[PDB]
Write a protein that binds this DNA or RNA. Structure first.
Ligand SMILES: Nc1ccn([C@H]2C[C@H](O)[C@@H](COP(=O)(O)OP(=O)(O)OP(=O)(O)O)O2)c(=O)n1
Ligand SMILES: [Mg+2]
Ligand SMILES: [Mg+2]
Ligand code: NA
Length: 326
DNA sequence: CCGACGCCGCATCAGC
DNA sequence: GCTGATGCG
DNA sequence: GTCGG
């Protein structure tokens, strides 16, 4: 929290460029600068001191000087005053409403939470569920609740078939004291890069977690990725727990280590790592790391038997999950 | 300068 | 129906 | 918005 004022400012600027300007590279520029400053271990005293970090350049340096001198940023104070930008920024907080849909709703005069509740008929299925649980999805999940959720999911998966392996990833696996959601990596030996020997491998899991009333809603669902909603059971007379976002991803078993590296994140860590892979002549996705040829075309999957094997290919010292929260 | 910026699953739609 | 682009996560 | 070549 040494430079929390600066990194908050940059995050608000990034969200502006994404939601309002629809300028995804500016959004990623601000996010990379906020990330490098957040892990900088001194209280920043000038914009020139910050410009020495990679991803902080002239414009952000000038913004850091304005912020340190005055405690404010005029650019943001004006953005905070513009109704259209403010309304667009708000609507994108609903899961399933991105910047395009948010600008379209505002064009049609749908600009508040009351406006969305009134116009449910204009929402697709995902947006409908995101509105339903808007308040709950804003809350963080204490690690102690993630531990009980973990216990439910792993035990219910064992009951379907003892050969499934379920691994909680995301910020939970990086050791966070609270999470935005539950991310679950799933494997089963009948599903590899070579063959799919059983159908419905993810369906069966979803159905079982629905049957015991853990999963309560579905945002999207295919053969390998489920995005939905879940809730801890409460006790007699106790207030219900908040509803929570749950993401489940079935990865070919022989590609576990690429998949667990991806699903552990953080998103900025993955971005930095994948960009560094490119500079080193490889491409990394959640399935494989492959070399790039002279023509820039990905070649065939390199062999991988651990998370560290991937770090080794691109000549990075290994970083434990807890050190990947960028 | 200025091109490149990580990578992909699912939902939806246009065009056929 | 399928294919490809687009939005969203 | 930033940066490497
Ligand atoms: N743009 C993104 C977003 C996510 N992910 C990967 C890394 C994340 O860790 C993982 C799960 O994404 P989440 O949105 O669930 O984020 P986290 O679990 O890291 O954090 P939170 O505590 O906010 O859920 O997916 C990624 O590679 N690129
Ligand atoms: Mg998560
Ligand atoms: Mg998630
Ligand atoms: Na949204």
């Amino acid at each position: 929290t040494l430079n929390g004022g600066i990194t908050d400012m940059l995050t608000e600027l990034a969200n502006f460029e994404k939601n309002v300007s629809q300028a995804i590279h500016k959004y990623n520029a601000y996010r990379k600068a906020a990330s490098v400053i957040a892990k900088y271990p001194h209280k920043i005293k000038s914009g020139a001191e910050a410009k020495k970090l990679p991803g902080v350049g002239t414009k952000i340096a000038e913004k850091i000087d304005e912020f340190l001198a005055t405690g404010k940023l005029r650019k943001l104070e004006k953005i905070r005053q513009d109704d259209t930008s403010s309304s667009i920024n708000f609507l994108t907080r609903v899961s399933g409403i991105g910047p395009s849909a948010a600008r379209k709703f505002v064009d049609e005069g749908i600009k508040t939470l009351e406006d969305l509740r009134k116009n449910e008929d204009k929402l697709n299925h995902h947006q409908r569920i995101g509105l339903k649980y808007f308040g709950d999805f804003e809350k963080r999940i204490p690690r102690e609740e993630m531990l009980q959720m973990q216990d439910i999911v792993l035990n219910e998966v064992k009951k379907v078939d003892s050969e499934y392996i379920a691994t909680v990833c995301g910020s939970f696996r990086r050791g966070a004291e609270s999470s935005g959601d539950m991310d679950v990596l799933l494997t089963h030996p009948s599903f590899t890069s070579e063959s799919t020997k059983q159908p419905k491998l993810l369906h069966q899991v979803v159905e079982q977690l629905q049957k015991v009333h853990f999963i309560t809603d579905t945002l999207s669902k295919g053969e390998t990725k489920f995005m939905g909603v879940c809730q801890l059971p409460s006790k007699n007379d106790e207030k219900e727990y908040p509803h929570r976002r749950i993401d489940i991803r079935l990865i070919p078993k022989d590609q576990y280590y690429c998949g667990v590296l991806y699903f552990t994140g953080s998103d900025i860590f993955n971005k930095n790592m994948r960009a560094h892979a490119l500079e080193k002549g490889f491409t990394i996705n959640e399935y494989t790391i492959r070399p790039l040829g002279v023509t820039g075309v990905a070649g065939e999957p390199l062999p991988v038997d651990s998370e560290k094997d991937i770090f080794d290919y691109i000549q990075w010292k290994y970083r434990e999950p807890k050190d990947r929260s960028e």
